[PDB]
Design a protein around this ligand. Structure first.
Ligand code: ADP
Ligand code: MG
Lengths: 525, 62
């Protein structure tokens, strides 16, 4: 049986530091009894030592055209990950040899972090392997046990290398942020031994008792939040943020991937159940406003299964979905109304807000609290935060100052008692983004003039009226476009954020960038 | 064979008097065994450590 172990080693360029161990282990096998337990453990040890690949590398495809064509074949819209992979190939052509990286993909659930790993492995022509460390409590899964134990087996990495038969596969480590910190041996310490270039080149498994070179393998780690990966681990791997998908992208995946797969797992052809583009867009707008695609998949499956029930029960021979009857399939819309006001009265101004479920529209209403043509006061309600309350105070002071010089005879703001409300009582809101909106509402109430009827604005205001950059420009722009806004006002410092957005988002918006509030006053009036 | 690796290296007595005992134990144990492997490693990495080798420090601040 020794000749079999010998012949298994012809195609392997075995390093000496383990070849010398293999030689003495074969000697021991030749010296031990035929049916001894030590003979059996030695033979198993040789089986593991000869089955592990030494020097075998897969023919990594390097063509940046074929690799790209593989990337857009399976997934849509993940431009950053695809660009990172194609700049791994480039850099591995200019260096010449197969190289390894340790890449971490993090983001909201259902955005494709786990699924893109198989497509990346296919593009690289690398063997693919996945194991999940979520809920992992013991180190024996990674580093195994000493072979002296009765049921000793190597770790997950050694089984990976044995199965893939290559020393440069793609190892997907899933849920690295949820690894359990067990008592009797923390597996995070072993993950640190795997994800460390200075020592992964000689990673040692307890069963093999010999080091293996894991510097050529491409580790891909998937996580949800970067705040809870162990500190020595998260500093040694590159972080790539896989953001969610906008409504148009969700429509693209739905038409291209989700609906065909749902039909395949449901048996409904396009003739039996019709799902047009308008129905899918309505589903995205009213039901699937999350960041991932799992909710959209569930809604599509719900529609198809209800159509299947209608067809099987004999109620109809074919089911055709319309926007007039989509609620008969998916129930009550989650987001039925985009804007409270169609034509704004004088005292109110439309604004924009950031929200996890896409962008959100907010309105600012001001009203006269006491009859008047001592000093005025401003009451503020709407579950506004401390920062937003301070923003409202600053906006009130600047509105007083601005009206003092633009209309000297107008003493509305300094004498009247005003109540300011943001009409969503149950939802807390905070941030200084609404300062310009508050100034505009106060000035419009004081002058008795409504603002442009399709205008939206956002931006922090200083005490002297300067407009400061604000965050969440993408969500605010999406909310404005969704609500039918034609003209949008932004701080001048957010020009790079606005023009970083995709062309289909900003196509129909007459954007204005301002440095001081007087420009906003000229725009809105 | 291990002694030659420390022939050109000064070895303290308190470990030299264990090196020979472990070498005798290796010479009396059966070849290619667990205890033989352990004794081989112990002799190897007693005779490999540089008891008598001192790196020259740099005395110049310049
Ligand atoms: N950009 C995309 N294009 C096509 N399908 C996608 C995309 N993102 C996610 N999916 C689909 O979503 C499903 C589950 O995604 P998953 O990989 O679990 O996301 P996550 O890693 O964020 O949990 C997969 O079957 C995949 O087909
Ligand atoms: Mg996942």
């Amino acid at each position: 049986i020794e000749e079999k172990f010998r012949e298994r080693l012809k195609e392997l360029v075995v390093p000496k530091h383990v070849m010398d161990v293999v030689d003495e282990e074969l000697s021991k096998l030749g010296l031990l009894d035929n049916h001894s337990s030590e003979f059996n453990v030695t033979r198993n040890y040789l089986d593991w030592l000869t089955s592990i690949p030494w020097g075998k590398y897969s023919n990594e495809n390097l063509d940046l055209a074929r690799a790209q064509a593989v990337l857009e074949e399976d997934h849509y819209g993940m431009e950053d990950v695809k660009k990172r992979i194609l700049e791994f190939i480039a850099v591995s052509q200019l260096r010449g040899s197969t190289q390894g990286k340790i890449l971490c993909f993090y983001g909201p659930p259902g955005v494709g972090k786990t699924s893109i790993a198989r497509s990346i492995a296919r593009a690289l022509n690398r063997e693919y392997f996945r194991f999940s460390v979520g809920g992992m409590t013991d180190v024996a899964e990674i580093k195994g046990h000493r072979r002296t134990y009765v049921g000793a087996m190597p770790g997950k990495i050694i089984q990976c290398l044995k199965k893939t038969k290559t020393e440069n596969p793609l190892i997907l480590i899933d849920e690295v942020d949820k690894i359990g910190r067990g008592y009797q041996g923390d597996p995070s310490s072993a993950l640190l031994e795997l994800l460390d270039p200075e020592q992964n080149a000689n990673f040692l498994d307890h069963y093999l008792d010999v080091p293996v070179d894991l510097s050529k393998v491409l580790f891909i780690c998937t996580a949800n939040v970067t705040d809870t990966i162990p500190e020595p681990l998260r500093d040694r791997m590159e972080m790539i943020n896989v953001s969610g998908y906008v409504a148009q992208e969700k429509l693209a995946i739905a038409e291209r991937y989700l609906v065909p797969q749902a039909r395949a797992l449901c048996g409904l052809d396009e003739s039996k159940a019709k799902l047009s583009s308008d129905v899918l867009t309505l589903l995205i707008k009213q039901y699937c406003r999350e960041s991932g695609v799992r909710n959209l998949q569930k809604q599509v499956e719900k529609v198809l299964r209800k159509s299947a029930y209608k067809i099987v029960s004999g109620e109809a021979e074919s089911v055709e979905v319309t926007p007039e009857n989509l609620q008969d399939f998916v129930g009550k819309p989650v987001f039925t109304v985009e804007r409270m006001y169609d034509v704004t009265p004088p005292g109110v101004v439309m604004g924009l807000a950031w929200t996890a479920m896409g962008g959100s529209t907010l309105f600012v209403e001001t009203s006269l609290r006491r009859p008047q043509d001592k000093d005025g006061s401003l009451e503020v309600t709407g579950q506004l935060g401390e920062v937003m309350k301070e923003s409202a105070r600053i906006a009130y002071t600047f509105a007083r100052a601005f009206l003092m010089q633009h209309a000297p005879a107008n003493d509305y703001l300094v004498t009247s008692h005003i109540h300011l409300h943001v009409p969503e009582g149950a939802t807390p809101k905070d941030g200084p983004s609404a300062g310009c909106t508050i100034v505009t509402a106060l000035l419009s109430l004081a002058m008795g003039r409504p603002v442009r009827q399709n205008l939206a604005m956002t931006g922090e205001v200083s005490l002297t009226g300067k407009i400061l950059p604000v965050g969440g420009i993408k969500e605010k722009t999406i909310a404005a476009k969704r609500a039918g806004v034609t003209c949008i006002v932004l701080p001048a410092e957010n020009k790079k954020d606005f023009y970083d957005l995709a062309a289909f988002i900003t196509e129909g918006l007459e954007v204005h960038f301002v440095e001081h509030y007087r420009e906003i006053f000229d725009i809105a009036f």
